[PDB]
Amino acid sequence: PLEGAKLSVAVKASGTATKAYNPNDVNELEGEAYINNLAVVVFNETGTELLGYKWEALSGAEHSAIIADVPTTKAVRARIIVLANVPRDLLSTVSTYDEFQTRLVDLSSQSQTNLTMSSQVIVTKSALSEEDNYLGYTDLGDQNVDGISDPILLTRVAARIDLVNISTRFAGTPFAGREVRIDAVGIYNMKTKSYYFSEADWGETEAPDAVRNSEDTSFEDLLVNDGTSISNTPFVHYVMENMKSDDHTMIAVKATLRGNSSYQDHTKIFTAVINAGGLQNGYDHNFIRRNYVYRLRIYFDGESFDNIPVTPPEPEVDTNLNIAVQVVGWGPVMQH
């Protein structure tokens, strides 16, 4: 019947919050901007009716891409959502906007070469036409729906935690000259579920689903002392947004202070809330936000372990681990 009413969308992966030159906010690993597929869902103004959808796999798309000729049954005002790296069949089961808002993306689908992104909820001011509609086409300018000529920004639902360094502060303490062995590193209180999108651009995607602890990443020969600078960043983990929950995302470190014939080995599990002082440090938020990278520096000191005398099992948890968190942008290197 009334066919030929279509929508074409030009997209771009959001890098940093500020559209400015900053080398420190360049933290994107290869693959993290891959656009394996694009999906567009179009609802009527109230989200009561589905006007159309399209999912499409892409080859060699990264940072920016196009999804052309999305069908839109009617020439009416619409509610549009654009997503990248989502399941092929997600949109085929869509009915209403309110039901689509309930859909959850699991952290198990997230990897360095596949990160789910989405746009804000675009509510058109003008009705769409019975012909070809466009969004994000810079060269078309005002011919775009509501003159939205800049590519639709797609923001990651995931966040990345990086353990950049572990060191000790034992000089002038009773633990001076002793080494600590890093047994394992993991994430405590991580959100493994997320909404696919938010109504606002870079809005809240945090899902109410109960937090979970990650599997521990073991280390064979990871020894630390006073002056240890780790250039490899031994632990990198994707997590979902976590800012509203009482169970704040934490770094977990099982560490052992080595013996010396006078004192026994001392093993504990050390935990610390990531970005507890973000707002005080000049960042736009505390805790974990979507599309942000968290650079963690860990320190052991004179208050970290006890001097247990040598004798002629379950490790205790110390929530008072001293850590420094640098919140950085998730931007790429300069493009063409």
Q: Are 47 and 15 in contact (CB under 8 A)?
A: no
Say if CB 52 and CB 193 are below 8 A apart. no
Residue 249 token pair: 């995302």
Solving technique: X-ray
- Diameter of the chain measured on Cα atoms: 90
Residue with tokens 């991580």: 190
Distance CA 278, CA 273 (A): 11
The arrangement of strands across the sheet holding 322-329 comes to: 235-240, 158-169, 292-301, 322-329
Please determine, looking at this structure, whether the domain spanning 157-189+210-242+251-333 carries the CATH number 2.60.40.3690.
Answer: yes
Domain with CATH 2.60.40.3690 in the chain: 157-189+210-242+251-333
Asked whether 7 and 128 are in contact (CB, 8 A), the reply is: yes
User: Which residues, 6+ apart, have CB-to-CB distance to 316 below 8 Å?
Assistant: 268, 269
Q: How far is it, in rounded angstroms, from Cα 165 to Cα 251?
A: 12
78-84/117-118 β-pairing: antiparallel
Choices 3.40.50.300, 3.40.50.450, 2.60.40.2580, 2.30.42.10: CATH for 1-156+191-209: 2.60.40.2580
CA torsion through residues 49, 54, 55, 60, sign: negative
Residues 175 and 263 sit within 8 Å (Cβ to Cβ): no
CA distance 69 to 313: 63
**Chain interruptions in the chain, by residue before each (C–N > 2.5 Å):** 312
322 bridge partner residues: 299
Closest-CA residue to 190 (of 110, 266, 245, 143): 245
| Residue 50 tokens, joined | 């589905």
Total Cβ atoms within 10 A of residue 189: 23
Tokens in use for 280? 């005080």
Nearest to 229 by CA among 300, 298, 165: 165
Six-digit token string for 7 = 């929508």
3-state helix, strand, coil in the chain (%, to 5): 5, 40, 50
H helices of 57-141, where?
97-100
| Number of residues assigned to the chain | 336
Give this entry's resolution in angstroms. 2.3
> Facing residues of 282 across strands?
none
Delimit the CATH 2.60.40.2580 region(s) of the chain. 1-156+191-209
| Chain centre to alpha carbon of residue 180 | 31
- Residue 111: Cβ-neighbour burial (10 angstroms; 0-12, 13-18, 19+): middle
Strands 292-301 and 317-318 come out as: unpaired
- List CB contacts of 247: < 8 A, sequence separation 6 or more: 189, 210, 211
Answer yes or no: are the C-beta atoms of 185 and 251 closer than 8 Å. yes
Tokens of 251: 């770094």
- In this structure, are residues 57 and 23 in contact, taking their beta carbons and an 8 Å threshold? no
